[PDB]
């Protein structure tokens, strides 16, 4: 038996589908999500991690003329100087006082640990759902892992069911992002190649193991001073670790709908967006036949105290007679109030206790006990606490219903203002008429 | 087969494809006597040369019909107030420079 | 140096861009493309090959009963008869003359090869560009791999140029697609656990190694034929088969835009469609000092002879005045023209000849000498081959320009009338002007 069915995407919601299909009895099928993975799709751009500068030893060729030669490393910078008279220690480096040139060189090189501490810049485009859903009708109590997009078809003990595309396609995680140990920046990293000296990605790589190392780094050398063999370099600091200091608020501090961030496979938990519709298929089996299923006449209801509070506020008990004794379902129909069970034993004795929460002062909601139904009414009352633990139990509908307080007396005044209208209205025209004929 | 000016490619047997290209080759006469120019556009875009020229001719034919219908009220209003009463129009001294001569005088 | 402009992705086309940096002599930088590969993403929705139907040997336990050993291979079909009487060479089979039963068993495989025959039945949703192109200004003539997506920044000696997103997001392949060897057809698979038998997708394993062998194909048994031992079955023959028969024509044969189709990385090879941006950014030692570059005046085209076929039908020779020797740049700002030459060689008489393309009876367009301008016009003529080997080397612009043969008569024509129109007008003004005061 199909039914198609929308459930709001919201972890720990205790969902209540009632389906009443013809010949058998109403059942209620209870369900909820537990978690939503949002995995993102990502392509590697390029992995930045802190470069090493490497300078190998001056070459000092006095009396002759070292010419400089060029290499092809990454930012490799040659520079080959005259009239210098290296002083290594013990006397001069040579016998011959000027016409000495030193080929200094440097360039840049990956840290020689970075598989242990690069920053990926992965840039994510689709999303991907995955959910954990618990599933309660009869008596299974079973959980399974879904992908909510309508082709993945999860059975769980007879019933199939089938999680359709998410209503909504909103991603917290915006086209480019960065991943760096733990954290999923929304940053927007310059183009492969084109890193600047300080700012992130001064050093690019292309895969953490490959070696392209575009490293960008102003790396500039300098006359050694006189009477010394240093080989001094003004390169500008580097531009990971400027990154580290000056990262900003990382995602996980700044998600939308409370979106917690995992980072190892790179995705966004609980997001509370959006609905899931699911459509069932459910085998006769799990269904009641009415004959042998208890009858409910003169169903009621009777609320002894509702405060509509972000928990189960409301009691409600039911008086009813039935033929017989046993369980069968119950659910409200309206939205406006949320019941705790969602089977309910039936005994000869007509009462039957029920939790309900709510969200408006008057509420109303038509009760479908076993079969029956009963126009339910309540004048609900507000807490006092201001500050709860736990997340919200309810749907967040506060219009009250007619016949509330507030709007009985909206109606009060306006049925009384219409009658003075009609009264006008009513003479005028009779004098108009009179007037005329 | 048809080989339109963005190509074709056709890959006969085992053979390695090969890929053509059509020139822009109308007949019909290059620069020179509209009658042989608007030959030479028809062949290229054959349905855009005759929707331009018929849409010219159109136009130029309304022009020309709206001189002449201009000219002959021109001609109302100039030779009305002459001949209402009287027979006279200056003849053709002021029969020629106001209005049309061809009034019978 | 900032500098932004658009190329058209059309593979060999000999593009041009002219860089005007004031207080430099003009740099004119050809590029062209020479392959563009598009790569979709993948997702292998399942795998399909021939199947192979085992069928294990009758187990005739006559002289007794056999029961229906139920297992959960791939569409495992076993059926248990009653009253054979198998005739297995040189007499009877056992020593009753009834109450015997054959346990036929049979179920689907995957072939004993198919890691050689199967066919992908991927779902490609999304596009990646990857393009090589070769960018010769001064002397360089290189040529480099880039993703043309916005984000690789190639650097050719200096110069950094960036290939931004393609300006179409056009791409020949659907939602759905399939791989068998060499081709890529566009089919509409049905989604995994749906085949039926006989059409495509009869046998699909989940991934070629992976063993679910959703199978399938209405395997169905028979009563042996009394006195003999077979096994009789009708199944529906390979679905595979089936569609290898009847695949149609592939993509290889029908893609627009003359997309050739690559199969093992699957991906679409000289797609001619959109524009490519491009943006570089160029160090001043590029370009040339106005002042070392010779400088040109009196500028004025000739057109030799204008042919406007496929290829660099027409020829034109510039007149100037220099004052020294050397070589700069040639271009045509306008689009109606495309050059060959890019830099041609200015000598002291005043003399230069070029060559243009262009698809445009009556063209008009600046071409820019060194530094100078001068507005350039011919009267070009239809080539007579109506077919040619080599692709076109002129943006297909075929619109002519004012002062042109064919729009000088109409402007002749339309002048006349519209002095005969101003000539009834002013007539027609007078004539009611002396009626009014």
Redesign the interface.
Known sequence: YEHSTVMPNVVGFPYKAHIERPGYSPLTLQMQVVETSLEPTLNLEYITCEYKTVVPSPYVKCCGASECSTKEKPDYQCKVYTGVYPFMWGGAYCFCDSENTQLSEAYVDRSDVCRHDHASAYKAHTASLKAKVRVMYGNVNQTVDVYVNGDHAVTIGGTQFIFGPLSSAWTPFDNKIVVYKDEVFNQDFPPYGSGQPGRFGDIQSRTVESNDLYANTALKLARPSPGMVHVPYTQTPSGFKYWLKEKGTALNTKAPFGCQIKTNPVRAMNCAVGNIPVSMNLPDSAFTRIVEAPTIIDLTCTVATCTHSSDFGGVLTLTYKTNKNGDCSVHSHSNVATLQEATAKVKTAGKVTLHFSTASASPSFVVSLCSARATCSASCEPPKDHIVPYAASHSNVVFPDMSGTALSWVQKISGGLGAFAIGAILVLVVVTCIGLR | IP?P???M?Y?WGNNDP?????????EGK???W?HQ?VQ??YG?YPAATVSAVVG?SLL?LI??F??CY??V??RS??LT?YALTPGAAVPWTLGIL??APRAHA
């Open positions: 080989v000016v963005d190509g490619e890959h090969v890929r053509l290209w059509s020139q822009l080759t109308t290059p620069h020179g509209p120019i030479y556009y290229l010219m130029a022009s020309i709206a001189s201009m000219l009220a021109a209003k100039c107030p106001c209005c």
